[PDB]
Amino acid sequence: RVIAMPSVRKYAREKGVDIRLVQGTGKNGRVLKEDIDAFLAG
Amino acid sequence: AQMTMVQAITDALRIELKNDPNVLIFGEDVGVNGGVFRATEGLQAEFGEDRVFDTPLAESGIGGLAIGLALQGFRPVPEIQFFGFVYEVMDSICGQMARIRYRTGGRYHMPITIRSPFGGGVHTPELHSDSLEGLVAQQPGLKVVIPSTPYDAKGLLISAIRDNDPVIFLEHLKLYRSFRQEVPEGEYTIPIGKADIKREGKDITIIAYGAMVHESLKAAAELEKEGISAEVVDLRTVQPLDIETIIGSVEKTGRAIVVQEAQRQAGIAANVVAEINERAILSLEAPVLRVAAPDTVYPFAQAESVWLPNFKDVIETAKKVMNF
Amino acid sequence: AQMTMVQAITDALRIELKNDPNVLIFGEDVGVNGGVFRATEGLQAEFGEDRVFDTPLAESGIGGLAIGLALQGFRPVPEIQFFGFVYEVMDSICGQMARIRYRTGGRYHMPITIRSPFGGGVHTPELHSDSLEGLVAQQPGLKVVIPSTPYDAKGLLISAIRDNDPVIFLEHLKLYRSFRQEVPEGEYTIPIGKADIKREGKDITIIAYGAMVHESLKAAAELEKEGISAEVVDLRTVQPLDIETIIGSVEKTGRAIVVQEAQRQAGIAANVVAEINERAILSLEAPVLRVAAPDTVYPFAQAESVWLPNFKDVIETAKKVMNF
Amino acid sequence: TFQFPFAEQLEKVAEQFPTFQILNEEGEVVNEEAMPELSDEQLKELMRRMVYTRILDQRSISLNRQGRLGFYAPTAGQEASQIASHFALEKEDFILPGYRDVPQIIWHGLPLYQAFLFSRGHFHGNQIPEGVNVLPPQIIIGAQYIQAAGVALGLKMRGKKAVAITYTGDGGTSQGDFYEGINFAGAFKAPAIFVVQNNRFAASTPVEKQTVAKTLAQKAVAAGIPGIQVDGMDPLAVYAAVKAARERAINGEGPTLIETLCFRYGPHTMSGDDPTRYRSKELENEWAKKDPLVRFRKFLEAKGLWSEEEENNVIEQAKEEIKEAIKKADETPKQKVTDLISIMFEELPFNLKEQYEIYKEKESK
Amino acid sequence: TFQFPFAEQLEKVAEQFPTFQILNEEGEVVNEEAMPELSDEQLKELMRRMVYTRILDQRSISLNRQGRLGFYAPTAGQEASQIASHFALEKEDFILPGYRDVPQIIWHGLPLYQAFLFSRGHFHGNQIPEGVNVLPPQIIIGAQYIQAAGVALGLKMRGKKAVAITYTGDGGTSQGDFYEGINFAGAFKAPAIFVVQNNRFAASTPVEKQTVAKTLAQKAVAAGIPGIQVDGMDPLAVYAAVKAARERAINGEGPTLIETLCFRYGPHTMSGDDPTRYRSKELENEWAKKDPLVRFRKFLEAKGLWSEEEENNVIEQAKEEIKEAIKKADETPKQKVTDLISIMFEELPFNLKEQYEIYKEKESK
Ligand SMILES: Cc1ncc(Cc2csc(CCOP(=O)(O)OP(=O)(O)O)c2C)c(N)n1
Ligand SMILES: Cc1ncc(Cc2csc(CCOP(=O)(O)OP(=O)(O)O)c2C)c(N)n1
Ligand SMILES: [K+]
Ligand SMILES: [K+]
Ligand SMILES: [Mg+2]
Ligand SMILES: [Mg+2]
Ligand SMILES: [Mg+2]
């Protein structure tokens, strides 16, 4: 499935992004408030 | 057969007395009278004063008597009248029996099962309803069991009695005769340290024990009327916790709350939360919130209704996690 | 002046005995002998036998004596020779004095301060070094203080004696004379429920109490060589916790661990972890892990060094959180 | 093989604790030289309080049955033991009662309505008026004993000419705290009066099952303090024994243990189903003559100091006062969580400050 | 004003507990009536064991100062109290010792190296051989008393002609568990022998601060069981008293409390305690003439049953055995965390199964 700390998950939700379609650049594919930002981005 | 929780307990005790002649039952007013809540009624008549007997009014002596008997090959099943009186026998329990096997490197052991009622909602006098399970949950060498149904009680108690180490069996006052359930006749066992799912759910995980399991079921039933599917997990043993079952439920739902009748600074809820965070943090959609009582001494009888946590508090907390 | 922790303890007591005529010191061998660790040395000689005296050997009787004396306007400061003997006086502590103000609706109160040493590292016999702070921390109506330095010990003890409610003051055996520290002469207090920063850090929050503070500071100094900036927080009161200070540090670092000398199923680390996971779950970048002792009975003397958590365990766990 | 004289030992210690009696079942003085100096009015008020307390028990049992009271431990039969002992105390004396010793604290200054609030479970019920020297009824059997040794010591150190009196039952003598309490008071030579109310039962458990000691008063021997066994169904014997223990105490000679031999006519408690837990039908019938009110009534009537009209007036005074107290109790405002929070500490710790705010929001909406 | 005979009560009771003595300070028989039946070979053996124990103490103290032993509570001076009491027991009897009663359990079957391991702090020291009926020394004063009552009840229930015997000091008599222990055994008429070793001190605290009771043996009155005060420096007296109590207990007559009047020459423990802070020199020299070894040596010599040749042989045999025991303890493998985990439960719970793997990993290196 997917993996991200809760702060992240809640950033993605607040922002109407479905974190599940974002590519994390973290250990094991963990998505970071950094990937969501580069998504909100293009 | 349809049995109440106290009936299933009495049946379980009768099964052990019959099965194992080493099993002894003793404490304040448990013999001829059959106990304060009739949990031992008829047992002395069937097995004799040599197997089921009354003792002098002293919890510490009752604890030492159990330890001494265990050293002589017996399987002691003493009773502390109300868990609030545990303060009188904390040494025998925590400083002694919980440590015997360790203390003697296996040379001696304590196949002891301590039965004791607790829990509120019945307007009992002072120090009768207090939840002090969180104390004994902190002592290595003990297993603490808290059933919520007649079926769990019978099976768990039988397991507790057969278990060759000290087991504290906590019986909630409000659950003794609150309802009936189909309980198989004859002996059967339920593993200690194993939780079960009282209600399958997919949106939120509700962890609870004791009388809070029913409250969690009521809340879940109400949440469902709004499309909120709650999974209610009954711990059934609070030490050791069933990590595999807890984490499994939390990982599936992504949201979780822990509900206990004990004060926030007490109980075992903090331990559950800490374990969930440690093992399933990156599966959490929100923080694991706790439903617990105010950090005051257990309330004077009249104030139970407003002080004790209930299904409405579980609903409110559950929705707070859903909307986080 | 440069004082050891025991010297600070004595100074604090001396100051209270002088400034407040209602202060009384009592317990087993605290008078002419001046206590097993000399914490009460010279006090009887200076203030008299009526204020500093020995008692028969009965912890429960000692607790009941403090309760009764408090009802007569005295400010009792009893001692339990080793906190492992707390099992003999649990009712007086948790079922009584902690509940008196509540039980009497404010009519009576318990300005009692119970001193008691604990902690390992000095090869004591059984039930001498056990960490049982987790039991009393679960009892509403009590405050539990555990200093790690002479300066803290004196200030917190003075505050403890002044506080009009029960305070349990735990004194770590290993820290009594481990090192000297500058301690101000005369009366000065340190707020109860207030933690402090032992080492200001930026990468991870190390939270500890008692002897684990030195192990944390020692560990932080080594983590620096590895480019890890660790902030050490000394809780200095484990009940209640200083939420403001704990959370502020975690909001800055985003990573934390909790270190205790007590068994994993005991102590107060779980409660600390549960509070962080709830209040600052949006500032966490890694799970809050715990450094604690194995879940066995306190180790036989010779097994202390391999069983007791130390600075290397804090190193290993801190790095585990950083590399998460 | 050599034989120690243990049977002799047991017999010799028994001879040291004979039953102290002043009035027999017929109200006749059987011990004239132990007779306490009480005036006619004092004698009249003692009887007034015993009759009052008897009515208090009837009404308490009834109200509890009507759900208008909560936890209640019947007292009928122990009037001499409970009331005549308290009648020997002074305002400055401090009482540490058990759960069944409510009548004592009421006569010592605790308003009746507050005693009813204790039964129901309301914090206000335990808010003893200032200046009244009592603790709320202790449920932890034995705890009042070690606390008593502490209170008595406090009085001693203050230089007060007062005593700490405490009560427990036959069953409670088996507790460690019972022993520790009387041993501490002895070691500190403290002004404490330890009273043991022996009715032969500790709920369902007969006294022979508590200990093999033939008397409970002899337990004072282990503490090195004097012990007295008295006819607990005799107001004069009880009063004289407590008076004698008070004088000894206020003179700095230490504590005393008093075993009162009595019998209760009611159930153990009103907590179900105790009120019908048994009960023995014939064992009670011969204790109907031993009733403290019966012998003390005859004793006063033969002295032309009592009459059935005077007794009826007391009963009417009790009933009226009992209704206004139960009524005053109903009017007391319900408990809020914030109330319970506010009484935990002088200064609330961080956790309670938060929760206080949480529960204040819930109590305002 | 009427007065109760409190003084007469206290005197008459204490009078029922006169010091029991067989051999005086000079080795002279003062009570041939109570002389225990002991063959010349048994008399020798008892002396050998008392001499052996003296050397053990001397050797243990030395070793502790060398850092070879850990926790040690000196025994010198209590040889009669500890050894002669044990000399009256049988293999089947169960001993529940305190921290200072290591000699009793040694002679009952605990190998000397395991006794030293207990001192150091190794779990194996407590791994008592099967069939040896003892528990490791109890650190919680009083705990052994309530456990002893249970053990005695167990023996009684299985119909075994054996007794449970336990030991505590003067200080321990103030504990609640001490009183609950003797009371429970009395209530259940259990075969238990309760020994109170009154060496006058509870650490720094003189026995007068513990209680005002004239004797400690009289504390049995509280439990309704027989009590005996004996000269704790007299081997024959201690033996005789315990043998009688054993005979009485196996015959199903219940428990007995025995107070031995003894004295220890060493410090309370071997860590910090300094005797010169609470006791006099003109008090230590007195009990030196009362030394159990002295009077018994003269007694045996007058019979031509003892000599300095035999005594020196026992002394050297003791040293050689201490030598091998300390060596065997040093050779005991060190404890691993996995060892302590494995001995926690029969079948480990989840939390321990995990931790077991963690430390099993760490121990591999
Ligand atoms: C430490 C503790 N353990 C058990 C109990 C439970 C109990 C409440 S009442 C009672 C019987 C007491 O009989 P006693 O003869 O002592 O007193 P009396 O009622 O006047 O006949 C018990 C065992 C309590 N309250 N505390
Ligand atoms: C429940 C508890 N509280 C305090 C202590 C601490 C202690 C260990 S030894 C001792 C003095 C006891 O002297 P006693 O005369 O009883 O025995 P003896 O040493 O042979 O002279 C104390 C106070 C322990 N171990 N347990
Ligand atoms: K068990
Ligand atoms: K305080
Ligand atoms: Mg106790
Ligand atoms: Mg009774
Ligand atoms: Mg001693």
Residue numbers in the entry:
A (entry chain I): 128 to 169
B (entry chain D), C (entry chain B): 1 to 324
D (entry chain A), E (entry chain C): 4 to 368
Sentences from the paper on this structure:
Pyruvate dehydrogenase (PDH) is a multienzyme complex that catalyzes the oxidative transformation of pyruvate to acetyl coenzyme A (CoA), CO2, and reducing equivalents in the form of NADH. The first step involves decarboxylation of pyruvate, which proceeds through formation of a covalent intermediate with the thiamine diphosphate cofactor (ThDP) in the active site of the pyruvate decarboxylase subunit (E1p; EC 1.2.4.2). E1p also catalyzes the second reaction step in which the acetyl group is transferred regiospecifically onto one of the sulfur atoms of a lipoyl moiety. The E1p enzyme from pyruvate dehydrogenase is a prototypical thiamine-dependent decarboxylase subunit from the extensive family of 2-oxo acid dehydrogenases.
We have also solved the structure of the E1p/E2p-PSBD complex with bound 2-(1-hydroxyethyl)-3-deazaThDP at 2.5 Å resolution, representing an analog of the postdecarboxylation enamine-ThDP intermediate. Crystal structures were also determined for the E1p active-site mutant with an interesting catalytic defect: I206α to A. Although crystals were also obtained of the mutants H128β to N and H128β to Q, these were lacking the cofactor and so are not presented here; however, they do corroborate the location of the PSBD (see below). I206α contacts the thiazolium ring of the ThDP cofactor. The crystal structure of the mutant in which this residue is replaced with alanine reveals changes in the hydration pattern within the active-site pocket, with water molecules now closer to the thiazole group of the cofactor. This mutant has much greater DCPIP activity than the wild-type enzyme, which might be attributed to the greater access to the pocket. In contrast to the boost in DCPIP activity, this mutant showed impaired PDH complex activity, in which the rate of reductive acetylation is the rate-limiting step (Fries et al., 2003b). The crystal structure of the complex of 3-deazaThDP with the G. stearothermophilus E1p I206Aα mutant reveals that active-site loops (residues α204–209 and α268–290) are ordered. The differences between the DCPIP and PDH assay activities for these mutants might reflect their differing roles in the first and the second steps of catalysis.
